[PDB]
Amino acid sequence: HWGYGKHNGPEHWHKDFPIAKGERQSPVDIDTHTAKYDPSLKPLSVSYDQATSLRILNNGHAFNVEFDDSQDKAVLKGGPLDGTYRLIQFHFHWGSLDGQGSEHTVDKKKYAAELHLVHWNTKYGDFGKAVQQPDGLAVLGIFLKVGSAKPGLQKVVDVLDSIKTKGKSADFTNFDPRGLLPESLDYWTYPGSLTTPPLLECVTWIVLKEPISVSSEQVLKFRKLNFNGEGEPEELMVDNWRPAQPLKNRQIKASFK
Numbered sequence: 550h551w552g553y554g555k556h557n558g559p560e561h562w563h564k565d566f567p568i569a570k571g572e573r574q575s576p577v578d579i580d581t582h583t584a585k586y587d588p589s590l591k592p593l594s595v596s597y598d599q600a601t602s603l604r605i606l607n608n609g610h611a612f613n614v615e616f617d618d619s620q621d622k623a624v625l626k627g628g629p630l631d632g633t634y635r636l637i638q639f640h641f642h643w644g645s646l647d648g649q650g651s652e653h654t655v656d657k658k659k660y661a662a663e664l665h666l667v668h669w670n671t672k673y674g675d676f677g678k679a680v681q682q683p684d685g686l687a688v689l690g691i692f693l694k695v696g697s698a699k700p701g702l703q704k705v706v707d708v709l710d711s712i713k714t715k716g717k718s719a720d721f722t723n724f725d726p727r728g729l730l731p732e733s734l735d736y737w738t739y740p741g742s743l744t745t746p747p748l749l750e751c752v753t754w755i756v757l758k759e760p761i762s763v764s765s766e767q768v769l770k771f772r773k774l775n776f777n778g779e780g781e782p783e784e785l786m787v788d789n790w791r792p793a794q795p796l797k798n799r800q801i802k803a804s805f806k
């Protein structure tokens with residue numbers, strides 16, 4: 550029964566999930582002046598040409614677009630990563646207003662939303678196994694700022710009223726996640742965690758420097774979703790973001806000078 554409210558939100562999660570106060574928790578503030586350019590970071594390889602999207606689901610915390618990860622169809626490699634990481638799903642975190650929503654912050658700036666493209670290390674064979682490993686997942690985080698519409702997000706936006714409430718899903722085949730990327734693949738990387746329970750410390754975070762622009766109308770539609778299931782009182786799905794957590798003994802590395 551965790552969520553994002555006063556009574557079940559992030560400040561409460563440590564009671565059920567004491568790793569909440571662990572040593573490699575996410576998200577973090579990315580201090581752009583303290584992150585170090587790491588000349589040894591291989592270039593990042595996002596190969597999504599063959600991606601097979603399937604379904605879009607409101608799970609009561611976010612909306613998830615799910616992909617067929619039974620084969621190496623959409624993968625992430627290179628940059629900080631060893632081996633191959635297979636795309637399983639993406640989702641967003643967003644705010645009730647344009648000035649908040651992202652999980653990661655950049656010199657304390659909050660963006661309106663944050664996209665997470667979630668990949669698991671194929672050497673651990675399934676996702677469940679991967680989340681039990683320090684290098685189990687690689688999450689590609691991309692900030693959303695409000696400006697001009699993002700055309701490759703609109704198929705997402707346009708379908709949301711079919712999954713208004715928790716537990717609703719719809720067919721979402723033939724969606725190409727490459728349309729959600731910015732131009733540049735410059736990134737920050739650091740070792741961290743899931744930003745939701747169970748908060749496992751199993752993520753290599755890769756956060757793109759260049760945000761994508763989305764329109765106000767686009768993000769507005771995210772905010773019309775519901776945390777609640779159908780035929781319950783309406784709690785709008787907003788502010789599903791965890792605030793920034795202590796960096797502790799970690800370094801954020803930059804791929805760019």
Ligand SMILES: Clc1ccc(Cc2nnn[n-]2)cc1
Binds near residue numbers: 637667688
């Ligand atoms: Cl499959 C999956 C993985 C992580 C999350 C939530 C999250 N953890 N870190 N960023 N988002 C939701 C679904």
Ligand SMILES: [Zn+2]
Binds near residue numbers: 640641
């Ligand atoms: Zn997320």
